[PDB]
Design a protein around this ligand. Structure first.
Ligand SMILES: N#Cc1cnn2c(Nc3ccc4c(c3)CC(=O)N4)cc(Cl)nc12
Ligand SMILES: N#Cc1cnn2c(Nc3ccc4c(c3)CC(=O)N4)cc(Cl)nc12
Ligand SMILES: [Cl-]
Ligand SMILES: [Cl-]
Lengths: 4, 123, 123, 4
């Protein structure tokens, strides 16, 4: 999971 | 403020290809000369300008069978259908002309681009 | 010996979400209490262990309407349906419990994982 | 396009  | 799962789109496409292999929820047969290819209309539209046009048509949207132009090569179509479902293109010296012509007909611009670049490098 | 187009899977998913927004080729309505959500069975199966089980069932595969457990929160379902079609999860303090419970019911393991990690960080 |  990432900060887009 | 959303978070994003990097592999989600790839995981979705892998499962759509599994559905195609098992012939689950396929709703169209694409006829290319003597050969038949089962697929999902939604995936075909998502990958191809030609299928996007065909399946948004108020009459063609309900057809269970679509016949492509007799000039279309079945192997070229097979390679492009595999690409649609996997992001992988089996581009070879022996098939590049058929792949590029099929990609132009199917309106798959990124495939056409690369076929053009690969041909230019060999001339 | 294939080549691969990096953005292909993301581009496919973006077009599947466009089809959902325009209600093109949607083949199921998911009923969550008083709310209704139209979707594509193939995308639901590709994202959820619950829908994969439901739509591989020889009777349920043909249903046009699926009713979820009355304990399922419509907003939680909405957030997860948006995630299925975009890879983006709108995870907030006010919705995390509903999102995690809905993801457990839908069998969306990566979403459950992250909800667990976000809750653990706040305790 | 890349070599996967
Ligand atoms: N709704 C919808 C929807 C479903 N599919 N789809 C598009 N599919 C498409 C149209 C043209 C081209 C390609 C894909 C690959 C290419 O080279 N050209 C576009 C849009 Cl703007 N919208 C949609
Ligand atoms: N054919 C087919 C096919 C269509 N969909 N699909 C799967 N869908 C799925 C099943 C379980 C789970 C998820 C997705 C996300 C998750 O957390 N669990 C799996 C397989 Cl093995 N195959 C398929
Ligand atoms: Cl393309
Ligand atoms: Cl997930």
């Amino acid at each position: 999971w990432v900060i887009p | 403020s959303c978070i994003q799962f990097t592999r989600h789109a790839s995981d979705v496409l892998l499962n759509l290809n599994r559905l195609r292999s098992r012939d689950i929820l396929t709703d169209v047969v694409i006829v290319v000369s003597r050969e038949q290819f089962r697929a999902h209309k939604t995936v075909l539209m998502a990958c191809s300008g030609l299928f996007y046009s065909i399946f948004t048509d108020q009459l063609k949207c309900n057809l269970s069978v679509i016949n492509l132009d007799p000039e279309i090569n079945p192997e070229g179509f097979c390679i492009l259908l595999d690409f649609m479902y996997t992001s992988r293109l089996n581009l070879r010296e022996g098939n590049i002309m058929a792949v590029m012509a099929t990609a132009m007909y199917l309106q798959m611009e990124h495939v056409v681009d690369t076929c053009r670049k690969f041909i230019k490098a060999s001339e």
